[PDB]
Design an enzyme around this catalytic site. Structure first.
Site, short mmCIF file in Angstrom:
data_model
loop_
_atom_site.label_atom_id
_atom_site.label_comp_id
_atom_site.label_asym_id
_atom_site.label_seq_id
_atom_site.Cartn_x
_atom_site.Cartn_y
_atom_site.Cartn_z
N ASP A 89 19.74 -7.86 6.53
CA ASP A 89 18.91 -7.69 7.72
C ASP A 89 19.74 -8.02 8.96
O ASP A 89 20.17 -9.16 9.14
CB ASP A 89 17.67 -8.57 7.66
CG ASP A 89 16.52 -8.00 8.47
OD1 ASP A 89 16.73 -7.71 9.67
OD2 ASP A 89 15.42 -7.84 7.92
N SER A 103 3.66 5.45 -2.26
CA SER A 103 3.04 4.56 -1.28
C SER A 103 1.88 3.80 -1.91
O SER A 103 1.44 4.12 -3.02
CB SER A 103 2.55 5.30 -0.04
OG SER A 103 1.52 6.22 -0.37
N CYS A 104 1.37 2.80 -1.21
CA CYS A 104 0.25 1.98 -1.73
C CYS A 104 -0.98 2.86 -2.00
O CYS A 104 -1.48 2.82 -3.14
CB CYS A 104 -0.12 0.87 -0.76
SG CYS A 104 -0.54 1.47 0.90
N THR A 105 -1.43 3.63 -1.00
CA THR A 105 -2.62 4.45 -1.17
C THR A 105 -2.47 5.41 -2.35
O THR A 105 -3.40 5.58 -3.14
CB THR A 105 -2.91 5.23 0.11
OG1 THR A 105 -2.99 4.33 1.21
CG2 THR A 105 -4.22 5.99 -0.01
N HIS A 109 -8.62 1.25 5.67
CA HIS A 109 -7.35 0.54 5.55
C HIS A 109 -7.28 -0.63 6.52
O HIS A 109 -7.79 -0.56 7.64
CB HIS A 109 -6.19 1.50 5.81
CG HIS A 109 -4.92 1.11 5.12
ND1 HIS A 109 -4.11 0.10 5.57
CD2 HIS A 109 -4.33 1.60 4.00
CE1 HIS A 109 -3.07 -0.02 4.76
NE2 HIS A 109 -3.18 0.88 3.80
N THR A 160 -3.17 10.92 6.78
CA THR A 160 -2.32 10.39 5.72
C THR A 160 -2.01 11.51 4.73
O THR A 160 -2.73 12.50 4.64
CB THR A 160 -2.97 9.21 5.00
OG1 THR A 160 -2.17 8.82 3.88
CG2 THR A 160 -4.37 9.57 4.52
N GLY A 161 -0.93 11.32 3.98
CA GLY A 161 -0.51 12.27 2.97
C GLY A 161 -0.56 11.77 1.54
O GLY A 161 0.02 12.43 0.66
N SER A 168 11.13 2.37 -1.19
CA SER A 168 9.77 1.84 -1.21
C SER A 168 8.89 2.50 -0.15
O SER A 168 8.27 1.84 0.68
CB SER A 168 9.80 0.33 -1.02
OG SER A 168 10.04 -0.01 0.33
N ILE A 224 7.45 -5.57 3.47
CA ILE A 224 7.65 -5.07 2.11
C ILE A 224 8.81 -5.79 1.44
O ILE A 224 8.73 -6.15 0.26
CB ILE A 224 7.86 -3.55 2.12
CG1 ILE A 224 6.57 -2.84 2.56
CG2 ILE A 224 8.28 -3.06 0.75
CD1 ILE A 224 6.72 -1.36 2.76
N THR A 245 -1.81 -2.80 10.03
CA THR A 245 -0.42 -2.89 9.60
C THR A 245 0.46 -3.24 10.80
O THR A 245 -0.02 -3.37 11.93
CB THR A 245 0.05 -1.59 8.94
OG1 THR A 245 0.14 -0.56 9.93
CG2 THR A 245 -0.92 -1.16 7.86
#
Lengths: 334, 334, 334, 334
Positions: free
Chosen positions: B34, B150-152, B178, B210-211, B121, B13, B181
């Site tokens: 990082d 989220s994306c979904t 999906h 998923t939520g 994110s 991401i 990942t």
């Protein structure tokens, strides 16, 4: 007293039906017809399988006959079905698995060769359709040309029957995530009518349309006009799954649905409808002979009248075993 | 007048957000943190991408700074977020993309380092959630810690908003097919809580919970308690799809739904919600910046009150572009 | 009189070794150690396998013990190998399969717990290496810590031994097309030292370096400094293959090579080195227990002194069966 | 002054050649022939591509002509090549890409329709073969029917030429790990002559035989009878790789080989032979126009006279670009 069976076509369905017949022993294969496959190639194709592994037994060619476990099998190479001498080889029932003779008129050519009854291993526009454990009691010896529907229909029908009998389905929409089949293509290639079906199978999901949900209405008359759906083709070898969303007439908590499905899978639909509460994935159902297996943990319910149910099915082995079971029941009905 | 942005974490991401920011030019990246990736490895990871191809531009390391298109970027290697000197580097907004700081208390540590606002994110348990084109007008400068969901959820929310505004969704169940990942595993391996998620990603479909559908209720208050669903993880690189089954309050033929969706995609939701009538497949949406694209030909309707709708989304590029757009809108609101 | 065996680590190699031991019956597993896997998870992981299918037998947990086919197994959760009470559980031999204790000093900690001998299921920098059918006659009871080398070495060693004994290999370079392993990653992700190994396993071939060809020199002293090679990692589940190019001292037509390889596979190397002339592919060797199978039809020879030979190997089942066979031979040598 | 080109067949090679011609602008396509693809399907197939993405430009049908970037293209649907009116459409050169007209007699039928010269985009049994950057200076206007060999040959020839010119190859054996092609099959299916080629492409490595290494001898006469090899087909979309093992006449350390290859890739073989020292994988060469790219870090040398070299090639884009380059050189030679 086992019936003699002839197989037309040595494609995936024909080879898997032969394998199921030899594994179970319910019927005896005595003849096979394929105009484009020779004897040695037939031995090679039957012996080795990428999905289901090596055949457990012996297969070889001797005196122009395919010998499987010591049983010789006559081989034909006719292109016209009416010219196949089924009666000479002793075949009483014929399995039409080429996929191009699905109407009653086209499939009836096998009767001219001496066959008594014809079973079409695919959906038919005008032949009667039967699904084992749902409406197979409706069959009668008066029938010479019938149909075993399709894999997706065989997965959806028993679960839908149980749910309708216990709670009264009002309307439902089905989605199936399906493994790749022989009609697809490795790389982007021409595809006459279905443009989406010509795209690369290894790189895409390629949505698709299907008629199994509608055919459930034919199998179960009370559900006529209350079901329909579509499919997604994913880059998986064989195992496939069904996802049914429906509205129920009577209130039904998820626990009650689980209880009724388990009870059905125990007594009446034993060997046809399975039940599991484990954390299974698709590969856990490879070479499984069930028509459908209910996944208790994967489903979800919004409320007491709106639920989503999940069922797994091996679209190769389960359908072939169902074809063999239907032929055995037909022979017993004689 | 572009806002200065710092990125915490150089995972998928974070790298994709940096790529989107440099491609669009709406914001300026000035810092990256990082603790496990060094400078040269950062250059290598940003330059090459298996899914989206080689970066169009120049990236190199000079004087301990990452230089992208001539713009130097400060690099940090702190493990404690409160010890990162965001203010010294000039970062005004911070994108928290590590996936482990999602609560308001955890994500607020970045404010101690000098950041003004924090954008998470990922879904958050207590931070306010915003989806571009749905409820992004609700944001105010009073907010320092928010979430982009989220994306979904970003795929489902605009289509659900249009459908609810035009026909009044009564209840719906969603299924998403999906792509794989980073949390999945190549071969059967240990997975602490989600046993199914530890199975081989290349060989199975591995159902999952998923939520996102529930989070749509948070984004759209009128739909609270009316949506839910699950997911299937297929062995595909990135492109994913959404399948929504819902019951409508008012009658709606499929043509009317198509007309309203096309009209919405033209004027108000331009660039967020797409529309297509071609025979598309999953690979046709690689590197597409839309949140969701309505597939007119793939859907099906049982009757005037029961329909199934299909929408595609690139779960990598679309979400990153939405994050950049949200940050730009926040900067404009200052 | 079967030896009692303890297994350290329940990863892929440990689980497959346990499966091989229970399938063959040559040894008896009495203890397992894994600090990160609990008992119920152990039952789940042993019962189901994506690559090799469901376990043929019964596995369950009872009184805190793993019961496989009625045999209870003690379970440990120690992180320090020196604190595992192998002697209390009755384990005489210990299989070190975690992959992080490969030196003699590190692997010798198991002796403090009461184990008599330790077998490292991976290449070792200083422990003696043995390959079944090649140099396993060199072992003596004086050895407490030894090594079984690696899968690739186990595939290459027998064929190289036969070829060297019959024609005198002068020098050779090996290439192996290898299936994906647990060390790879589904999507582009961080990888500390091997940057190529961090790229997406499903989308690339990711070349790699290996030391199996060099280790063949350790196993066969006369071939020291005459072999080396590299590997390619392809997106396949398990089956892998070896490709050896070598120059021969004595003239050898391809027919003579085929004859000598077949003769070796019949008598002396029965069950270790296979031979086939059929048109096989990779999936035909799934769950095959041979160390290597010579593919007669796939090889090619430029002239009488320059040939290329092909051999298949299941890198999961074959190595585990070889580990069990080595332990059985060690027990017989007592 | 650009030459007018007609394309016979709209398969993968034909579509990619058209794409390369429109992207580079070296030649002008004016006609296309395909008896099984209609105009609208042609538009759909050209617009969308799973491997190389959406076409950058405009394509549409107008007045029965394919219009690409504003240039109309005549469309034919003839099955007999001698009946195609190439001269009427203005096509001077014709690209024969159907793969079934490879002999001089068969390919010469296009001359009856008015074409001046014919280029066969595949190996030919009797037509002269040319590889760009290796022997393309040998061509003369006296030639009407020639061949561009094959992708694998185009990858192997430049590297072999450089190595032979600098160190004197004595003999070598080549192995190529190749991506899947249109001739393969998704699931186990019939395959007339090549039984291995009929097995499932997604599940196996399916070894195979090839003649590219032998054809290198035709392209480079001094290497006649000194090269040969085989191939492995892996389940990857397109990118493929070459692995060459050879014995050198003169001593050559790996550094010297790297230096000479880099020098060749800079000046003389610019755009044909690439050079890289980065940690690349297969997906890094998607849509790369080079014939071959030398991977410095992946190779290995046993000693000063026995080395193994690795080169990458996009078997789709590189070959098409080479075909366009050859046609441009032929036009310049007029």
């Amino acid at each position: 007293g086992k019936v003699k069976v002839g197989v037309n076509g040595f494609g995936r369905i024909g080879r898997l039906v032969t394998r199921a017949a030899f594994n179970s022993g319910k019927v005896d294969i005595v003849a096979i017809n394929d105009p484009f496959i020779d004897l040695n190639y037939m031995v090679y194709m039957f012996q080795y399988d990428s999905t289901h592994g090596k055949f457990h037994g012996t297969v070889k060619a001797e005196n122009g006959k395919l010998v499987i476990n010591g049983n010789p099998i006559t081989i034909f190479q006719e292109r016209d079905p009416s010219k196949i001498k089924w009666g000479d080889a002793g075949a009483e029932y014929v399995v039409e698995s080429t996929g191009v003779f699905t109407t009653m008129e086209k499939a009836g050519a096998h009767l001219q060769g001496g066959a008594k009854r014809v079973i079409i291993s695919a959906p038919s526009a005008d032949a009667p359709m039967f699904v084992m454990g749902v409406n197979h009691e409706k069959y009668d010896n008066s029938l010479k040309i019938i149909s075993n529907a399709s894999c997706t229909t065989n997965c959806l029908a028993p679960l839908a029957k149980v749910i309708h009998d216990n709670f009264g389905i009002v309307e439902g929409l089905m989605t199936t995530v399906h493994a790749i089949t022989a009609t697809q293509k490795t790389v982007d290639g021409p595809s006459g009518k279905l443009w989406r079906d010509g795209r690369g199978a290894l790189q895409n999901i390629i949505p698709a349309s299907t008629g199994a949900a509608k055919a459930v209405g034919k199998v179960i008359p009370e559900l006529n006009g209350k079901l329909t759906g579509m499919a997604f083709r994913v880059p998986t070898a064989n195992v496939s799954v069904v996802d049914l969303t429906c509205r129920l007439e009577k209130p039904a908590k998820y626990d009650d649905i689980k209880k009724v499905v388990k009870q059905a899978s125990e007594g009446p639909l034993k060997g046809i409808l399975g039940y599991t509460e484990h954390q299974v994935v698709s590969s856990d159902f490879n070479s499984d002979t069930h028509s459908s297996t209910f996944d208790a943990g994967a489903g979800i319910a919004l409320n007491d009248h709106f639920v989503k149910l999940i069922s797994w099915y091996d679209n190769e082995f389960g359908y072939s075993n169902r074809v063999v079971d239907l032929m055995a029941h037909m022979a017993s009905k004689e």
